[PDB]
Design an enzyme around this catalytic site. Sequence first.
Site, short mmCIF file in Angstrom:
data_model
loop_
_atom_site.label_atom_id
_atom_site.label_comp_id
_atom_site.label_asym_id
_atom_site.label_seq_id
_atom_site.Cartn_x
_atom_site.Cartn_y
_atom_site.Cartn_z
N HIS B 90 91.57 30.43 95.49
CA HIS B 90 90.58 30.04 94.54
C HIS B 90 90.37 28.54 94.57
CE1 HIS B 90 94.35 29.37 92.33
NE2 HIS B 90 93.66 28.49 91.63
N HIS B 92 88.99 25.04 91.63
CA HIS B 92 88.71 24.60 90.27
C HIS B 92 87.74 23.40 90.21
CE1 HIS B 92 92.29 26.86 89.18
NE2 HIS B 92 93.03 26.11 89.99
N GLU B 96 94.39 20.02 89.82
CA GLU B 96 95.54 20.80 89.37
C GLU B 96 96.88 20.13 89.71
OE1 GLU B 96 95.57 24.94 90.22
OE2 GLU B 96 97.65 24.89 90.85
N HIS B 270 102.21 3.68 75.43
CA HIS B 270 101.58 3.64 76.74
C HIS B 270 100.31 2.84 76.67
CE1 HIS B 270 104.60 6.37 78.10
NE2 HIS B 270 104.35 7.15 77.06
N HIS B 314 105.60 5.75 69.67
CA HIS B 314 106.45 6.93 69.53
C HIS B 314 107.85 6.80 70.11
CE1 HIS B 314 104.31 7.16 73.33
NE2 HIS B 314 105.17 8.05 73.78
N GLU B 328 106.32 14.19 80.59
CA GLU B 328 105.30 13.30 80.03
C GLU B 328 104.18 13.29 81.06
OE1 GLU B 328 107.33 9.53 79.96
OE2 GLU B 328 108.00 9.78 77.89
MN LIG Z 1 94.74 26.72 90.81
MN LIG Z 2 105.71 8.29 75.97
#
Ligand SMILES: [Mn+2]
Ligand SMILES: [Mn+2]
Lengths: 377, 377, 377, 377, 377
Positions: B90, B92, B96, B270, B314, B328
């Site tokens: 497939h 997208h 990914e 960040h 955070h 993360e």
């Molecule tokens: Mn895929």
């Molecule tokens: Mn972080």
Amino acid sequence: DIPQPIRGDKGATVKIPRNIERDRQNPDMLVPPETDHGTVSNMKFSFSDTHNRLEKGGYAREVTVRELPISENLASVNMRLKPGAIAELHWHKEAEWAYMIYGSARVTIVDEKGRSFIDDVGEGDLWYFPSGLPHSIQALEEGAEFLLVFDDGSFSENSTFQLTDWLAHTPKEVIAANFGVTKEEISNLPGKEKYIFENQLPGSLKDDIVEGPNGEVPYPFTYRLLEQEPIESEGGKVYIADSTNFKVSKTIASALVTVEPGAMRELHWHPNTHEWQYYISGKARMTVFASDGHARTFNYQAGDVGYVPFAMGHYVENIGDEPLVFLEIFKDDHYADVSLNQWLAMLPETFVQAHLDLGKDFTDVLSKEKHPVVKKK
Amino acid sequence: DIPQPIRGDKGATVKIPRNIERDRQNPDMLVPPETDHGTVSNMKFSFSDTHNRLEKGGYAREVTVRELPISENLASVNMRLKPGAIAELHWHKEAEWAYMIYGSARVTIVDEKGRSFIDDVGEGDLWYFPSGLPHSIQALEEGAEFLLVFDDGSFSENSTFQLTDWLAHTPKEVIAANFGVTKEEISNLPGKEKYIFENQLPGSLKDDIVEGPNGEVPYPFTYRLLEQEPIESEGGKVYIADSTNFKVSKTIASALVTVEPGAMRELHWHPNTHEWQYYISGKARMTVFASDGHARTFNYQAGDVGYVPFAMGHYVENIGDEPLVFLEIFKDDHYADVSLNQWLAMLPETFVQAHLDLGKDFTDVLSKEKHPVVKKK
Amino acid sequence: DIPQPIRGDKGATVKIPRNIERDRQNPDMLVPPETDHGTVSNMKFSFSDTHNRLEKGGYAREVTVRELPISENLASVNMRLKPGAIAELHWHKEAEWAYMIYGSARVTIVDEKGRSFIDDVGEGDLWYFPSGLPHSIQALEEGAEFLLVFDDGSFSENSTFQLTDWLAHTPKEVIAANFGVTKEEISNLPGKEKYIFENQLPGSLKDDIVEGPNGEVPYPFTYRLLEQEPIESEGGKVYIADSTNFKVSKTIASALVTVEPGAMRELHWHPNTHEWQYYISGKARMTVFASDGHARTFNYQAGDVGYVPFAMGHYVENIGDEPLVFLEIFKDDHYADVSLNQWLAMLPETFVQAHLDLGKDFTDVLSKEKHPVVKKK
Amino acid sequence: DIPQPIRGDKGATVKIPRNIERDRQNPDMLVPPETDHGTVSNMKFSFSDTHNRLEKGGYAREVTVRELPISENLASVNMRLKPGAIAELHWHKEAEWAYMIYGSARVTIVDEKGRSFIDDVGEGDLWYFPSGLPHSIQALEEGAEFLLVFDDGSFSENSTFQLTDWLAHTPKEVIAANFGVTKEEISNLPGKEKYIFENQLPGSLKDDIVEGPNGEVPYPFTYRLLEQEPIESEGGKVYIADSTNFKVSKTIASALVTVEPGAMRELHWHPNTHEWQYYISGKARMTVFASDGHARTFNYQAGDVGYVPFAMGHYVENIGDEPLVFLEIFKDDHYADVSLNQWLAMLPETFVQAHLDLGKDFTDVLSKEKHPVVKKK
Amino acid sequence: DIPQPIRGDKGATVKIPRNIERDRQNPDMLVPPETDHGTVSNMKFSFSDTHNRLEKGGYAREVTVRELPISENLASVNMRLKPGAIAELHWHKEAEWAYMIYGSARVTIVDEKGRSFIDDVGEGDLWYFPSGLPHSIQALEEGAEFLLVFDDGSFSENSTFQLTDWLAHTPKEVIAANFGVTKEEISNLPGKEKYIFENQLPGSLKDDIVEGPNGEVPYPFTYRLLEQEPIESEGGKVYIADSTNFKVSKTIASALVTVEPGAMRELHWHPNTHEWQYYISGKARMTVFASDGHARTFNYQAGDVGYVPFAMGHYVENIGDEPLVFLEIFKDDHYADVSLNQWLAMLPETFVQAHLDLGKDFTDVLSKEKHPVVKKK
Ligand SMILES: [Mn+2]
Ligand SMILES: [Mn+2]
Ligand SMILES: [Mn+2]
Ligand SMILES: [Mn+2]
Ligand SMILES: [Mn+2]
Ligand SMILES: [Mn+2]
Ligand SMILES: [Mn+2]
Ligand SMILES: [Mn+2]
Ligand SMILES: [Mn+2]
Ligand SMILES: [Mn+2]
């Protein structure tokens, strides 16, 4: 035991660390009907998964568009007050609707003509405060825990205006001028909001009623939902409260629904607007039919908010031993539904048969009377 | 026992039917730090609370903007394959990215110059497939369960194009013309997609490598994250993989983080973009600092997605006995953080003191080396 | 004859007044492949169905998002100039790309460093003018008719700034101050725009070249597309021009495609961005594969704009006796495609077979070389 | 002959391959009035240029915002049924309005109180089905071809809910519980939608009327438009149907307009809302006056949808030998127009003269009676 | 005297109560050039018309999209510090750019690798702090007043994260764990932000420089704009600072412009992006040419923000006796303009003449060298 996402020869055991207690609460999500298909937005969120704002005298936690993004038009607050504790005099951009689940409370509200309404509300009672009109809640001897619904999904801190917060950010000289007092006579005004605060129990309701030059309000702001005669059917009852019986409730129509063990809220849809749900007790599953071959089943229990977008097909089936009690909420001046059974019952039988590829043996079981809740034969 | 939303003299017992097992998983949500304040959007969602799509050979469930609306730029799929089972060829609209949590798999991908890449991926390995390039996943002897991340929060059925689905909706005469065959030679083409399907285990990886006139791909599509030397500190390790070391991963930067019992991912933010989190095992809490006096604490355990909007302050603290393992994820060509400790450590000490109303006894404990994970002294 | 929307036992004769000449141009829209399914947006619009702006010296008509709403990123102008006629010196918010279909023209453009470029463009030549840089077009002895493409679908009157229009709405005293002249020396300035205007043929190109203190521009603004060697295959040729060979064309990649009678542009997709199409001559049909079982077939002939949203599967088949000539346009710094044939050709054969439910007799016909245009065996 | 975009000394011959049959249908687009000026969005689209969905028993093709982006509030379906063929029982998010152009049909609809309405509709009749109420269409002996209008321009597959599609994606056990039957008694339910399907002609209308415990519906869902007395003027007739005479049609106001050869729908505008047009037969041109010197002329014939945004000035002139028949459609509870003639006729004559720079010889021809359609003196 | 909106025989005396002092500041708004035409958005706003936030040690007032809605990409702060006073250590979602108009200051900034930069900035110096990197400002002996520009027009309280605010809303136990200290050692942390606060003057800059294990930053964060050699022309100077000379300033390009009495910034436009203006001293007028016959003239003096949308034609003319000093600001990696004079100077003269309806007497005055500022001959 330990649930697994397997249905016949489909699915497989979970192999990564997982949340077992959640899988157990979601049997029909971990193992969906084989009839579910396609992308359907999340229609399920637990108040348990929200931050609880704790104050001296109670707490309040919310489910909004920021938690449940499908519900753009409606949000909700779960609020608790200890006995005598006050939800500080305030007002909202949104209209407010409420179900008293536990305890009792006294509410005040003054309308745009200076007319006042003070009343006590008990379990199963509602109130509705039109947008912008100031109000308060104070819990009586038992305390009070209730569900609030606001007719904007965007409800946030910016939706609420608080009496003491206003005065805290108004020049002292203006306040003094506004009232005809010295600045000293008001130096004790609070510096920040109160929001919820401890207080002594009020006295009797008649000693609180304030008389005024402007008349009684034309329509009460409260309603005794459980004192109505409910639509009673085989497996449960339904009490409706919309702007046709609870007059002031122009933007919120509602129904309390009771589904006995082994019963269901029948297959139906709403031809008027979106449905917003609160699950008070019991355990349910519902399949939302989303058109064009899309359908998704969700699981519900106490503390969950649910949602059915406008006109989508659904049912709500009790899957537990306790009775299932939920609220159906609609941002509209009226309740309305279309019953799959009654619909088909009022069409020529051979027409229905040509559609369904079934015989007289099916159409004979259709009924022309709407039974919102049915017991499994 | 039975948790209650009480903190000192604030809050009260819950009085309505409730979800106890959820309250237990959310100690810091039912009973928030007293430092939490203001409206902060939901930054927490469990894969356990999503519909699981079961097929012959595995399953796949998703967390998207429709479940977690704060994460507009990133969505994720939890996908499982039984041994030999194929995620049908497939492509997208989204890029990914993937973490192999369990098992192993073979991936194929062909790039825009006709060059092919076939490789095996094991626990702790990643792959990244640039948008629009076709690929597949097939599980080896052990099966495979992995986390996929797509760089659009809107990921839905409309993001994925399937090999057999294409051919099913292409005129038979066109397909035949496209390949130089009769319509009969292709009457056996599937009528619908496959998506995931059972199959025999592949053989060895070298027997699968396809030679071509176009060359080897210039940069591999997989990466061995756990074979890198990690930034090791007191209470854990951190392995980073961004476009600086895993070259093809232009839109996804990532770090696997391990926090020992009694340790935390330090206070940081960040400066580049939003953080998206997946909690693989263990239990955490995090407070997101949202500016202007807004902060909200969330609870996390295995199966949860978490989120920290761009630049919000955070930390992530392990609150359990097992080690805490989380991902993360950043939609960017690079990982970057600013450490509260290191920041303050590189400023003149009396400057820091003037800010914090504290003495040399504090500034002496600041460190100029970044320790992403710290153990409680 | 008279076409009817019938395919086997489906469809029926049209019974209301109808547009027969249109039905004839749309055989595959009135009678779609049985493989078409679902809602797909309109991907087809004729310049013939737009208002033609006629001026002394030529005309110009446009296809934009307001005509074809799928194409949000790209719009186009069909512009015609009589011999010697000038497209008045102007500039755009959008970058401009052009194909000279008929005739020849002289273009000027001055860049942000004061450097000038004056060149002649003939049939099959392109130009690209980066956003905001001022330019002009003047037709030579034969006149000129060409296709312009702008890299914003919203292109409108507000996208274009005209030399004389500027001066007409600038205070006379400012203009005079700006140039060091009296107001009288400029009383003859036009009162309104010119847009297109008749003029004498220029002389030779070398007598027009303006020398300046700032150097030659580093990269030409024109390109001789048909003088390149094309990718020649069985049933046609393809000439690509993107920012890798036509350097200044950073926002527009393009390919001229020629499909012989009985041939097709193969089944492929674009992994980079949306495709915008112009059909110069011939007749085509294309099926756009839109994912999740959605596909729609459109018909095309001279004067039509076509469109394929990012990553959607497609082919373009010549359905006429003339050759089929069309442009593929991409708002990107590069051309890229993935070929269904080549993709499958670079995967292990038994893998492809397991996917397609077909044998060695199919996979033997796959080719590892990309043939963009194929003749029907 | 061969049309060219020339008007006096403006424009030029087309020199590239072109669509001659379209240019012929668009005389006033290829050669616009000299009074047209500025950017005006496309207000014209042919059903002939849309994909026709063919089923056993008929077909249906649509014009929506995705084809005609100016019309955001309204879309339309051209639907055809062979004799006896059924538009499967279904419901919509949008209200549905319909004109029977050819044939006849039987409709059913059940309302939110369980009350049913079954009626036959012939050429020139309308129906209006309020949003969310379920309905059907079955063609009688002659078949039926009709125009449907939905009060959302976004109408798509997701607007429609189908009886069999619902049941196909509802768990078999739920359906069985909902009706009080075994799963076996319902194993024959269809697996997919029907949409349109062949069937035997119904019998007489009186044998189909279903009696019920809930009463007759308070207002019929059909209307005999051509049986009304029309506003008849010099060059044509106009039949209006809005919520003032066709009571249930709260969101759709409409007028059938007939313009004889040599006549026009006069210069007017609508002070209430946008106009949506369907051209049933004949040939027209219209100039939309868009304010601030913007105006664009469009050409129309059978099968075309047209559009005039709120309050824009227009006329519709017959430019053919046949009569011109079109629908004017408004998403409102009422029809309303302002007539340029009548407006000026009810102002002091010297006032009108001061505005227009013309004399008593003009104002004497103004009329205080509204004549919607006028014949050329 | 008393200004009136009269120009020749147009306009009239103002007859209602009015703001005379404003009319006096807006001669060209109350009495616009006769060349102005059409709707053009407001491009003018005074910092004087914004709420000034006063703190112990200084103040700060802002102009944002909420004041000036055309400027969606850029906002600004006017900030003042008394000697020694600190803009509390903080960070932003936006990049920050600054012009020191008065005084001097010390800035700190630590980057994502732990490297620190501490420098002094004087009148005419700039700094640029990339998004998310923490920084501070402290005024030296003279105090400091400077203009800040942020590269998002939406800049608000939610754009800024403050050191003490973070710590105030972080659990005390987390902070203690993060640093390896007791909760007692940190009980003195401030309870709320500081924002701006009084402090003692720093010492020498060399005694503040912090050494670290991570190296010096690769590129300084400050720039000495007035120490550059400016483009000097007849009536003024222009100093440019973009990412080509001030390396770190990737999102902000800028030019300080000086226009002598009787001079103007020439007629030009920007082919890259929008212009944002700050008027430091003097008095100007500018006409923005908005395309399609739209143009509007605005008046400017000290404290005003101005704006020219992308590619619109403009000039800025000094209309006072003092010199005119303004900033031109662009959210881009580079400064770029196109000069009306130079453009026309690099085209064939007879071509320019054919466009403008003027002779050799005009074209002889064109210059091929760009003179950004010209003195009135
Ligand atoms: Mn895929
Ligand atoms: Mn972080
Ligand atoms: Mn309230
Ligand atoms: Mn319902
Ligand atoms: Mn141009
Ligand atoms: Mn293509
Ligand atoms: Mn319908
Ligand atoms: Mn009209
Ligand atoms: Mn700052
Ligand atoms: Mn400028």
